[PDB]
């Protein structure tokens, strides 16, 4: 399986940018209502960038 989710690395480049679009998405979320959706994106990049170093190749 992990051959097929390796291949799939391929949308990690086209996911990173997938979040930049929503991050400028939250300009239309509600001042109070910008912060519980608006920010969450900020949390899945924040543990996303220990990730990469962990990641570290591996079985690949």
Avoid: C, E, H
């Avoid at 209502?33 to 190749?57: E, W």
């Amino acid at each position: 399986i992990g051959t097929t989710l390796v291949a799939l690395s391929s949308f990690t480049p086209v996911l990173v940018i997938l979040l930049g679009v929503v991050g400028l998405s939250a300009l239309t979320g509600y001042l109070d209502y910008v912060l519980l959706p608006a920010l969450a994106i900020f949390i899945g990049l924040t543990i996303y960038a220990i990730q990469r170093k962990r990641q570290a190749d591996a079985s690949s």
